[PDB]
Design a protein around this nucleic acid. Structure first.
Ligand SMILES: Nc1ncnc2c1ncn2[C@@H]1O[C@H](COP(=O)(O)OP(=O)(O)NP(=O)(O)O)[C@@H](O)[C@H]1O
Ligand code: SF4
Length: 738
DNA sequence: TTTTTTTTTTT
C-alpha cells in the first residue's frame, strides 16, 4: 500500500544533484534527429545477441515503501564472455574531458540498470559502458568498467535512502489527495446548462485515454467543467499529472481561482504556475550552490504548500537562495497540476524535457483558447536569419585571430543567404539548404571557445545574439520535412532567410501521443475539423455547446455592403452613415475593423466623437481605454479584428450594448498565406478556406462574443459584409448570429 | 476572387 512509481533518470536527478548550474551542461538546441542517426549507426555495429532499447524494471521494498523503478538501456548482451550494458549519450563537452565518473548522473543510471540485470539473471559481475558522441562532429568515445552485484546493490539502496526524504511526503500527499477528491462535490450550488454533458465527456476522455475537442460558448464555465472532471479522474487513479496550458499570462488566474474555491471545499492538492525566467528573477549568485540547496527548499514547499504561485516561488527562492526558474521546473515534477504557457509543451526549444521526451507518467493536457495554437504553433517551428545582423557582428570583431575565423564564418553564411536570394525580392525553396546548415554549424564551433574566454570584450552581447539565432535556426531545421518550405525575402535593405512551418499536424501529433488525454477547448473553434487537422488530432471526439443565454436578449442585423478591398473608398460613406445612426442609440458601442487603414479611413468621414485604438498601447493605457466604458458613458469605439480588444474584454451589463463587425476578417493576402494556401491545396484541402476563410471567420466569432457576457446582458450585433450571407461564411457564423 | 493583428519563452 506504500508505492512510489519513478524513472531511473528522476531518481538520479534528485539523489546525485550537487554543485552549481553552470557545471551541469544542457544543450536545448541539440539537433535530435541527427543525433538519433548516430545512435542508430552505433547500434548497427552490435551483434544479433546484443538486443537494443531494452526496458529494465525493478520493485524494491525499502522503508516499508515499494519503489517501482523503470529505465531503458540502449543495448544489453554478452561481449567478450561478460554481459555488457551500453548507454548512448550526446555531449557538447570535449571527449578528453569524459572519464569514469565525469558525469555522476549518467553513471548512476547505468549502475541502476546493472543492479536490475544482475539480480534478474543471477549475474555476479557486469560491464557497464557509456558511449558518448557529438552530433555536429560524429566523434565517439567509450568508457567501460566492471562492477560487482554487491557493489551495485549497495549503490542502488544508497540512492533510495537519498530519495526517501521525498518518497514519504509524496506518499502521504497521494493518500490525502485521493481522499479529498473522492469526497469532493461540484463546488457550485448546481450544474449550469451543458456543464454535466461537458464534464462527463472530459471525465470519459481522461478515463479511456482519448482526445476531445470542445467549442463551449460564454456562460457554460469551461474552466471548472474541464478541471473538476480531470481532478476527479486523478482521485480514481486514471491520470497522474494535469497540465493547464494558456496562450496568455492573464488566463492562468482562472485556474488558480477555481483551485482556491475547491481548496475551501476540502480539496487537498499541489499545483505550480510556471513563470518565464525574465519574470521570476528575484532581482546568478544563487547559481553557485543551487543544486546543494534546491532539494531542501523543495521539501519545505511540498510540506507547507498547496497552490504555488509566482510570489511564493520568489519568496522560497530568495529564502533558500536558489534560482526560481530551476525551482519551479523541479516543483512541476512533484505537483499534480501544472499551469503554464503552450511553449512548455509544443515549443521545440523550451518544452519540459523531464516530461515530454520519454513519459513514464500519465499526462492529461487541458488546452485553453486552443484557437490561438494554430498561428502560434507555426511560429514555434519557423525561424529566420538576417544578413544585416550577421554583417553588423563582423564589423565589431577586431581582426584578432580568434575573431577572424568567426568573422569569416559569418561572411560565408551572409553570402550563402544572398546567393540563394538570386537577386529576387522573394525566393522560395522546397528543400533545406545543406550549405547554409553546414556554415551555421561551423560558425557555432568557432564562436564557442571565444564565448568562454572573452566575456570582458565589449561586443560579447552582440556576438552571443548571432550565436543564439544560429543555434535556434539549426534547431528548427532539424524538423524540416515536406510540411516546410524555405522563403527568402529581399526587402528593407535586408535579405531575411526564413524556414517556415506551413502545417504543424505531424509534429503536434507525434507530441500528443505521449499523453494519455488531450482536451482542446475554446469559445471559438469552428469548424472543429479544421482545428483538429492543424493541431495534430487524428482520432477524436467533438462537442459543440451553444450559448446558454436567452435568444431574445440578442438581435443580429446583417448589412449587405461590399467591403472588398477594391470597393472600400467607394463604400466608406455608407459605413459612416450606419455608424452615425448606431451612435444615436443608447449605450456604448464597439465597432471592429479588419485593418487600421480601414479604421482611419472611416474615422475621417465620421462627424461625431469616436474613441479609436492605436497600434501601440501600454497596459495602463489599455485599462484607461476600457475604463471610459462606464455604465453612464455613450462612447463609440473603433477597434481592429483580432486585436487586443477583440479578446478578453468583459464589458458586461451596460458598459457595452452594441457591437459591429465590418469584414469577414480575411487575413491580408500575402506570400506567407499563399504558401499555406498552396500547401493545403496540394494535400487535399480547400486552401483558401484553410488560409483565409477559417482564420477570418474565427476572428469575427471572437469579436462578436464581446457583446452578450451574462444571461441578463442584452444588445445588438451588426454584421456588415455581403459575404455574411454567402457560403462558406454563413455556415461559419454562430447559430445565434444568423 | 478574395488585402492582418499580435503572445509566448527562449542566449
Ligand atoms: N455551475 C456554476 N454555478 C455558478 N457559477 C459558475 C458555475 N460554473 C462556472 N461558474 C462561474 O462562471 C464563470 C465561468 O468562467 P469561465 O469558465 O472562465 O468562462 P465561460 O463562462 O466559459 N466564458 P468564456 O470563457 O468567455 O467563453 C466563473 O466565474 C465560474 O466560477
Ligand atoms: S537567480 Fe536569476 S539570474 Fe540567477 S540563475 Fe536563477 S534565474 Fe538566473
Amino acid at each position: 500500500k506504500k508505492e512510489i512509481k519513478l524513472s531511473v533518470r528522476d531518481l538520479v536527478e534528485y539523489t546525485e544533484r550537487s554543485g552549481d548550474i553552470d557545471d551541469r551542461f544542457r544543450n536545448v538546441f541539440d539537433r535530435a534527429k541527427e543525433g538519433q542517426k548516430i545512435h542508430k549507426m552505433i547500434q548497427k555495429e552490435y551483434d544479433i545477441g546484443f538486443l537494443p532499447e531494452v526496458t529494465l524494471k525493478n520493485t524494491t521494498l525499502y522503508k516499508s515503501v515499494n519503489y517501482i523503478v523503470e529505465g531503458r538501456a540502449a543495448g544489453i548482451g554478452i561481449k567478450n564472455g561478460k554481459t555488457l550494458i551500453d548507454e548512448i549519450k550526446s555531449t557538447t563537452r570535449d571527449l578528453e574531458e569524459l572519464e569514469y565518473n565525469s558525469n555522476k548522473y549518467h553513471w548512476a543510471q547505468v549502475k541502476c540498470y546493472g543492479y536490475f540485470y544482475t539480480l534478474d539473471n543471477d549475474l555476479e559481475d557486469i560491464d557497464l559502458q557509456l558511449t558518448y558522441y557529438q552530433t555536429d562532429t560524429k566523434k565517439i568515445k567509450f568508457i567501460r568498467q566492471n562492477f560487482t552485484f554487491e557493489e551495485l546493490k549497495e549503490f542502488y539502496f544508497s540512492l533510495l535512502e537519498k530519495y526517501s526524504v521525498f518518497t514519504e511526503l509524496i506518499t502521504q500527499h497521494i493518500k490525502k489527495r485521493d481522499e479529498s477528491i473522492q469526497n469532493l462535490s461540484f463546488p457550485y450550488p448546481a450544474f449550469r446548462a451543458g456543464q454535466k454533458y461537458l464534464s462527463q465527456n472530459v471525465y470519459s476522455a481522461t478515463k479511456q485515454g482519448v482526445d476531445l475537442m470542445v467549442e463551449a460558448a460564454t456562460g457554460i464555465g469551461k474552466t471548472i467543467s474541464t478541471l473538476f472532471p480531470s481532478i476527479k479522474a486523478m482521485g480514481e487513479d486514471l491520470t497522474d499529472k494535469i497540465f493547464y496550458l494558456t496562450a496568455k499570462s492573464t488566463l492562468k488566474k482562472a485556474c488558480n481561482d477555481q483551485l482556491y474555491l475547491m481548496k475551501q471545499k476540502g480539496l487537498i492538492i499541489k499545483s505550480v504556475e510556471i513563470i518565464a525566467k525574465n519574470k521570476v528573477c528575484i532581482n546568478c549568485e544563487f547559481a553557485k550552490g543551487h543544486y546543494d540547496r534546491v532539494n531542501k527548499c523543495i521539501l519545505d514547499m511540498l510540506e507547507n504548500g498547496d497552490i504555488i504561485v509566482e510570489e511564493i516561488i520568489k519568496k522560497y527562492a530568495f529564502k533558500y537562495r536558489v534560482c526560481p526558474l530551476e525551482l519551479e521546473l523541479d516543483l512541476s515534477n512533484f505537483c499534480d497540476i501544472v499551469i503554464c504557457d503552450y511553449n512548455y509543451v509544443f515549443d521545440p526549444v523550451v518544452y519540459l524535457k523531464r516530461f515530454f521526451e520519454v513519459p513514464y507518467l500519465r499526462m492529461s493536457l487541458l488546452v485553453d483558447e486552443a484557437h490561438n495554437l494554430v498561428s502560434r504553433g507555426r511560429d514555434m517551428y519557423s525561424y529566420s536569419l538576417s544578413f544585416n545582423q550577421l554583417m553588423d557582428c563582423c564589423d565589431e570583431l577586431v581582426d584578432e585571430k580568434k575573431e577572424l575565423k568567426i568573422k569569416r564564418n559569418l561572411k560565408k553564411i551572409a553570402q550563402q543567404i544572398k546567393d540563394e536570394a538570386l537577386g529576387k525580392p522573394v525566393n522560395t525553396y522546397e528543400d533545406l539548404s545543406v550549405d547554409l546548415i553546414d556554415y551555421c554549424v561551423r560558425c557555432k564551433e568557432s564562436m564557442t571557445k571565444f564565448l568562454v574566454e572573452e566575456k570582458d570584450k565589449p561586443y560579447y552581447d552582440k556576438v552571443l545574439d548571432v550565436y543564439f539565432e544560429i543555434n535556434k535556426f539549426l534547431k528548427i531545421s532539424d524538423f524540416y520535412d515536406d510540411s516546410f518550405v524555405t522563403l527568402i525575402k529581399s526587402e528593407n535593405d535586408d535579405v531575411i532567410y526564413n524556414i517556415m512551418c506551413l502545417n504543424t499536424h505531424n509534429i503536434f501529433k507525434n507530441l500528443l501521443k505521449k499523453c494519455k488525454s488531450n482536451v482542446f477547448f475554446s469559445a471559438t473553434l469552428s469548424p472543429m475539423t479544421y482545428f483538429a487537422d492543424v493541431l495534430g488530432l487524428e482520432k477524436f471526439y467533438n462537442i459543440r455547446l451553444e450559448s446558454p443565454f436567452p435568444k431574445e436578449n440578442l438581435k443580429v442585423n446583417h448589412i449587405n455592403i461590399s467591403t472588398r478591398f477594391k470597393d472600400r473608398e467607394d463604400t466608406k460613406y455608407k459605413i459612416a452613415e450606419i455608424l452615425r445612426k448606431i451612435n444615436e442609440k443608447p449605450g456604448n458601442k464597439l465597432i471592429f475593423f479588419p485593418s487600421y487603414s480601414y479604421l482611419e479611413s472611416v474615422y475621417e468621414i465620421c462627424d461625431f466623437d469616436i474613441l479609436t485604438q492605436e497600434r501601440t498601447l501600454t497596459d495602463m493605457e489599455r485599462l484607461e481605454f476600457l475604463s471610459q466604458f462606464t455604465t453612464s458613458s455613450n462612447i463609440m469605439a473603433f477597434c481592429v479584428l483580432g486585436g487586443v480588444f477583440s479578446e478578453g474584454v468583459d464589458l458586461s451589463g451596460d458598459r457595452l450594448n452594441t457591437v459591429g463587425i465590418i469584414s469577414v476578417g480575411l487575413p491580408g493576402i500575402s506570400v506567407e498565406n499563399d504558401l499555406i494556401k498552396k500547401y493545403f491545396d496540394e494535400n487535399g484541402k480547400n486552401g483558401f478556406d484553410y488560409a483565409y476563410v477559417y482564420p477570418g471567420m474565427n476572428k469575427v466569432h471572437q469579436a462578436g462574443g464581446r457583446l452578450i457576457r451574462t444571461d441578463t446582458d442584452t444588445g445588438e450585433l451588426f454584421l456588415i459584409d455581403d459575404r455574411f450571407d454567402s457560403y462558406p461564411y454563413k455556415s461559419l457564423l454562430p447559430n445565434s448570429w444568423k
